[PDB]
Design an enzyme around this catalytic site. Structure first.
Site, PDB file in Angstrom:
ATOM      1  N   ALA A   1      48.204  57.851 -21.036  1.00 30.97           N
ATOM      2  CA  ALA A   1      47.319  58.780 -21.758  1.00 30.97           C
ATOM      3  C   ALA A   1      47.715  60.253 -21.677  1.00 30.97           C
ATOM      4  O   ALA A   1      47.578  60.989 -22.661  1.00 30.97           O
ATOM      5  CB  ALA A   1      45.872  58.601 -21.292  1.00 30.97           C
TER       6      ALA A   1
ATOM      7  N   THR B   1      26.471  23.237 -23.545  1.00 32.55           N
ATOM      8  CA  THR B   1      25.109  22.776 -23.196  1.00 32.55           C
ATOM      9  C   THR B   1      24.978  22.226 -21.766  1.00 32.55           C
ATOM     10  O   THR B   1      23.971  21.603 -21.425  1.00 32.55           O
ATOM     11  CB  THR B   1      24.501  21.781 -24.237  1.00 32.55           C
TER      12      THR B   1
ATOM     13  N   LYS C   1       0.819  -1.240   0.000  1.00 34.13           N
ATOM     14  CA  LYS C   1       0.000   0.000   0.000  1.00 34.13           C
ATOM     15  C   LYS C   1       0.846   1.281   0.000  1.00 34.13           C
ATOM     16  O   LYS C   1       0.320   2.396  -0.113  1.00 34.13           O
ATOM     17  CB  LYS C   1      -1.039   0.035   1.143  1.00 34.13           C
TER      18      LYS C   1
ATOM     19  N   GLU D   1      31.982  29.660 -28.099  1.00 35.24           N
ATOM     20  CA  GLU D   1      31.052  29.152 -29.109  1.00 35.24           C
ATOM     21  C   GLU D   1      30.295  30.255 -29.867  1.00 35.24           C
ATOM     22  O   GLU D   1      29.499  29.975 -30.764  1.00 35.24           O
ATOM     23  CB  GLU D   1      30.079  28.136 -28.484  1.00 35.24           C
TER      24      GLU D   1
ATOM     25  N   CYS E   1      32.252  31.232 -23.454  1.00 37.90           N
ATOM     26  CA  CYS E   1      32.100  29.815 -23.819  1.00 37.90           C
ATOM     27  C   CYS E   1      32.782  29.369 -25.127  1.00 37.90           C
ATOM     28  O   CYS E   1      32.712  28.190 -25.493  1.00 37.90           O
ATOM     29  CB  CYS E   1      30.612  29.428 -23.856  1.00 37.90           C
TER      30      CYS E   1
ATOM     31  N   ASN F   1      33.093  34.747 -26.681  1.00 42.17           N
ATOM     32  CA  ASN F   1      32.483  34.941 -25.362  1.00 42.17           C
ATOM     33  C   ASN F   1      33.162  34.118 -24.266  1.00 42.17           C
ATOM     34  O   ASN F   1      34.294  33.666 -24.426  1.00 42.17           O
ATOM     35  CB  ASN F   1      30.987  34.634 -25.423  1.00 42.17           C
TER      36      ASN F   1
END
Lengths: 739, 739
Positions: free
Chosen positions: B263, B608, B17, B430, B428, B426
């Site tokens: 600069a 991913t 049960k 990719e 990653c 970036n």
């Protein structure tokens, strides 16, 4: 032996000429124990045969020194060798020196770079020898050469690695770098600058008329919003106010601690110290003008913080290396309720900063009506009154940080309470100015020597200080400083935004341990009290009636409808007190109510970072930290004063290399050469107070004053911080030097 | 036995049960070996006494997991428990959940917090009678335990210690705020989402039609200028872009190195070393708007830098206190001139950036007759090439870093030749886009689930894998994102203006390992090469004809003309290789010409690992990293086939709580199963250069590509890092895991 002269030949070494170089510059010196024979007889022995005369004069500017071991008539004898070396590579005049520097094309690539201005350059194409026939090049050698071991060092600007500048051009570009087209009120700045009456501070001698002029001394930068946006508009600001110099003292009383709820993605802002390290990585990157003075930043918190325990033991060396940020100087701003929590003993709330909006605000009678209800509701946690105090003082016993300050009194007796309450001070704990997202109040300072107005009265016997000259010279400066808030090319818009408004200022002194020990009034008795009130009560009358005349003509400092100056009030009257009376106070108060004043905040004295140094006077309103400086320096008013009553030949030379400035224990000094030259370690700090409540009442702004000890206990700190608020001090503790 | 109910009534666990709620939930997965009789006892035994059936699952549901010690049917079984257990405290309703989060009276101070924008909320009320009426709660019980334990962890919106949305609610709440008002394109999404066809970007899970709909994962935050002006900008540009989440691959190819000419301050800046750590206390501190997931960026750089040595090994622990950065990913942007100058052997100039800059804006043959212009006069110094190459393969020998992505290859062959020279990839590796002063080009991630298509091919004994419908699946997503590119919320000026423009987008693949080991196929042979080609001839074609027709209706992109696409050109035709043939490239080619394309870039297969696990698949195109995981896990297809040719046991299983998921030795293991279940450290590194080229010709952007090998001796990382460029690979390295 042979010597190589200014060309490349060979000199048979003479002994009547190397001290005809000397016994004709052993001058005015009272040489009862000083002779030119005792000299070159310890130099000739250590003379190379592969080192030029300049590099021979190197050893002398170091050797004539080994002889101040008996009398103070060798410093200006080792100064007449150093400053004489720069009289060499670049000839005497103020024109040519300031000539091939404007047309300045570099070795690397090939572009003309104007080292100097068009300003302090095109008031000299027509006025050049009124500035070389009124310039006596003798006052290249009235500077103590440590002030010049600051001038050669970098102060006298350089070319191809050459200190082309002497001191007499280290004093004059600051005359028409300020006044210029009014050449007439310009030389009156130089006149007393080469006499040691007053020297301008750390930055006012840096760039006094070069291409894009920044000349304001102490910034009071403002943070613009807690959260990601309004913090990138202060990260760059103090950074920008650290590329072009300028020490800062930032304020934070509404940025979300390590407990506060997040206004976005949800979580918690990690608090107060993941802040003092991004900004520290900025407090540690922009060397104020690429490789000059690096960037120093005072910071101002309060006990009511949930992270007031993250922020006090900061300048401590241990406790890891990520929550300890070692170069972002912390300073207090204590609510004067946390104090009347400490003595009675009780409790104290520490809200999590989104828990109290405009608690980054309340003051005095309005903080005792905006905290009375912020605990009968419990909007943070209430920790003890004498336990944060035991972490305030313990942050101070490893390090020295922080600097004890009160919030109410910096707007009570302070001249700002109209445009917004004063939130921030500066780097140095005396500039009491209001800062905002738009308003940024700047400051320009300078150092007036007090061993420069002292003179012999009209029966030999006795001599009181000269009050006219510390006043008739201090008139020149409020016209020197009404052309410095002016010609300031501000780096962005903020520094500009709120310096053209109020136009606030800070004036002080440099040589208090030159004046007492000079005026034949000891450093600690009655004749001490009856001299320090009337040195500032005159300054608060020497710089406020030459600002009182500066409103008949140009137009007053923009915001005047409300500032105490026009309602029967000034400063010391806010101090629950009256004046001295010799100066015209029933008529100068009157002198500003119909016409006005061009200045806002004035009286703010300074310890002079890189400035008393030069003048060969003891820094600010302090005596001797030690009598043996570095190496070595013999205290001179204790060498002009211990070679005559029967107390100089050799022995006592060890009486101070380990004793730590201890003429407290000396034999053949009866009782009038022990008190006046009390070293700071053995003088009581209870009574540097009663005269500072007699030297804080005529102070528009605030003042920075140290607290000293020889054997440290925190109950001495419950009887030294405890004696700087019931009177009502403008700062409870500046710094602290232990043991 | 007692187990007090979720409500209040007194319940007992029995033998059928509390396992019959599980023997009724026994559909779709084999019962041969899996019997609901072997275990309940041993948990019922582990059952103590003192916790409600609100918390009766903690061990119980976690236990069926420990039972993947036989077959992959205890896993997708373990969840069927818990799903039936979140189904408890929650009131499912799609209009009582969305009538408790809108009117959300936050008793945390007074102010409610939105979790949905004022558009998506109302898309529910008049829809609820067919938007609480298509949600099948069998697919709630079809997700793997670890796809859930990442969602219950931090992904899902959690309220008062109670989670808000169950899976499908989210799978459909990622459908009423993308397409916004299209509801027959809201079902279009969820299905294929809840039908194992595909999964969206990283943020489309976290912020799909939420308060500030920020849906972009990949950023390209660029360095503005060479002083405080343009540096404290990229600082505020990597901060708001990261307050609302999103990793970065900052390029810094125009800031002056250790030793240059500042600069206008007159001195020297320390370079790229006390520079990258002002940024550090923002990477570390802001955990994506506080206490979420903090910052670690891919810092892209080119070799000619005079600080390319004080950099490449930055991720090594054992050396010093400040110089290393252990939490900011180093990255490279190598020219077609560096890789051609470590073969025959000579030297290379590492320039200073106020001496020879703008090569950061040169490439291919804008390098080979423009770099030979800065070197053959000598504008730096000429140091060796078998030493820097060594400190890269030292950083790769230790840290792993850096990621190798070439420049004069990420510039000459793409579909954007009308905006500028590509300066950075970036975080990653990719994304290949144009980032400039305020042209921050953006990307929303995505990756198509490849397996579920394998159909009951037309008998049940020999299966099919599908490109037929994978195409059209790679079609509806390129609709999804054009509705995602748009319903966004960007934090500055930068991140926007280069997103409505080029309109570049990021699609990928995941579950590539599930498919091979499935289809009677290993990861290597001709039975495996030609395959990873027609799968990407059905995706790239589709995504770039799911936007060829959004140049009819929506319209083409502002700077499409000039791009190869408008010239009878694309990608596999810019890689100069013959067309495959199954798909339409004479008509699609003839219909971009005349009509256009809404998007420039679709292909960008990230790691991913921001999407793969929530489902159940693997970390993109890579195979398995250990046939035994953690909570240990043993290959399931391996575990299913174990009962076929009868090698399933425990004696050759204590051979995989051991070998580390490796299969090369066992006396008896069949030929095409030896071949079937190999680890990653056990196959050669030559042909991952042939098939990546058989998967980069139909790929416009770059792809993230790790490289695994146990042995890092440099006389081996030789003709093993080369081939990945002599053929022409993009990101020529991402991660070097030794171990």
């Amino acid at each position: 032996m042979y010597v190589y002269k200014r060309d490349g030949r060979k000199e048979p070494v003479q002994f009547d000429k190397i001290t005809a170089r000397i016994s004709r510059l052993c001058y005015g010196l009272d040489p009862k124990h000083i002779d030119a024979v005792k000299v070159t007889q310890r130099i000739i022995s250590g003379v190379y045969e592969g080192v030029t005369t300049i590099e021979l004069d190197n050893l002398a500017a170091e050797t004539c020194a080994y002889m101040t071991t008996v009398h103070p008539d060798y410093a200006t004898l080792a100064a007449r060798i150093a400053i004489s070396n720069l009289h060499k590579q670049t000839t005497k005049q103020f024109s040519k020196v300031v000539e091939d520097l404007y047309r300045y094309v570099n070795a690397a690539t090939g572009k003309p770079a104007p080292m100097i201005s068009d300003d302090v350059y095109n008031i000299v194409m027509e006025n050049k020898d009124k500035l070389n026939s009124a310039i006596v090049y003798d006052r290249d050698f009235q500077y103590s050469y440590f002030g010049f071991k600051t001038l050669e060092r970098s102060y006298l600007l350089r070319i191809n690695g050459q200190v082309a500048e002497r001191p007499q051009h280290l004093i004059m570009r600051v005359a028409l770098g300020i006044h210029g087209r009014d050449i007439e009120a310009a030389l009156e700045t130089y006149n007393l600058m080469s006499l040691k009456y007053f020297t301008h501070a750390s930055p006012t001698l840096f760039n006094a008329g070069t291409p894009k002029p920044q000349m304001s001394s102490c910034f009071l930068v403002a943070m613009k919003e807690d959260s990601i946006e309004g913090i990138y508009d202060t990260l760059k600001e103090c950074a920008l106010i650290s590329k072009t110099a300028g020490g800062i003292g930032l304020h934070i009383h509404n940025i979300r601690s390590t407990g506060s709820y997040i206004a976005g993605t949800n979580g918690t802002s990690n608090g107060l110290i993941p802040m003092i390290r991004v900004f520290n990585n900025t407090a540690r990157y922009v060397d104020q003008g690429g490789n000059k003075r690096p960037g120093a930043f005072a910071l101002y918190l309060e006990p009511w913080h949930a992270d007031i325990f993250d922020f006090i033991d900061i300048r401590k060396n241990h406790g890891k290396e990520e929550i300890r940020a070692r170069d972002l100087f912390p300073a207090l701003w204590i609510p004067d309720l946390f104090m009347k929590r400490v003595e009675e003993n009780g409790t104290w709330t520490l809200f999590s900063p989104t828990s109290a909006p405009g608690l980054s605000d309340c003051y005095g009678d309005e903080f005792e009506a905006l905290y009375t209800r912020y605990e009968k509701e419990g909007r943070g946690k209430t920790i003890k009154a004498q336990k944060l105090w035991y972490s305030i003082l313990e942050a101070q016993t490893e390090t020295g940080t922080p600097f004890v300050v009160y919030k109410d009194a910096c707007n009570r007796k302070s001249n700002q309470k109209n445009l917004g309450v004063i939130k921030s001070s500066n780097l140095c704990c005396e500039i009491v100015e209001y800062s905002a997202p738009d308003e940024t109040a700047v400051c320009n300072l300078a150092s007036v020597a007090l061993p420069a107005f002292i003179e012999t009265s009209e029966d030999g016997k006795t001599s009181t200080y000269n009050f006219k000259k510390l006043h008739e010279i201090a008139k020149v400066v409020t016209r020197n400083l009404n052309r410095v808030i002016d010609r300031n090319y501000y780096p962005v818009e903020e520094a500009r935004k709120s310096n053209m408004r109020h136009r606030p200022i800070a004036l002080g002194v440099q040589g208090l341990a030159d004046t007492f020990m000079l005026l034949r009034l000891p450093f600690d008795s009655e004749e001490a009290r009856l001299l320090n009130i009337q040195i500032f009560e005159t300054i608060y009358h020497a710089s406020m009636e030459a600002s009182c005349e500066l409103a008949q003509k140009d137009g007053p400092y923009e915001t005047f409808q409300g500032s105490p100056a026009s309602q029967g009030i000034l400063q010391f009257d806010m101090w629950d007190q009256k004046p001295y009376g010799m100066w015209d106070w029933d008529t100068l108060r009157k002198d500003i109510m119909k016409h006005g004043v061009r200045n806002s905040l004035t009286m703010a004295p300074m310890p002079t970072a890189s400035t008393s140094q030069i003048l060969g006077y003891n820094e600010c309103f302090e005596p001797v930290t030690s009598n043996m400086y570095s190496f070595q320096v013999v205290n001179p008013y204790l060498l002009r004063d211990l070679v005559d009553l029967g107390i100089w030949d050799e022995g006592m030379k060890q009486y101070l290399i380990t004793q730590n400035g201890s003429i407290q224990g000396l034999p053949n000094v009866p009782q009038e050469l022990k008190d006046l030259y009390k070293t700071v370690w053995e003088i009581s700090q209870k009574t540097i107070i009663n005269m500072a409540a007699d030297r804080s009442v005529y102070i528009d702004q605030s003042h920075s004053l140290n607290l000293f000890l020889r054997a440290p206990t925190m109950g001495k700190l419950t009887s030294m911080h405890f004696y700087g608020w019931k009177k009502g001090l403008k700062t409870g503790m500046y710094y602290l030097r232990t043991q």
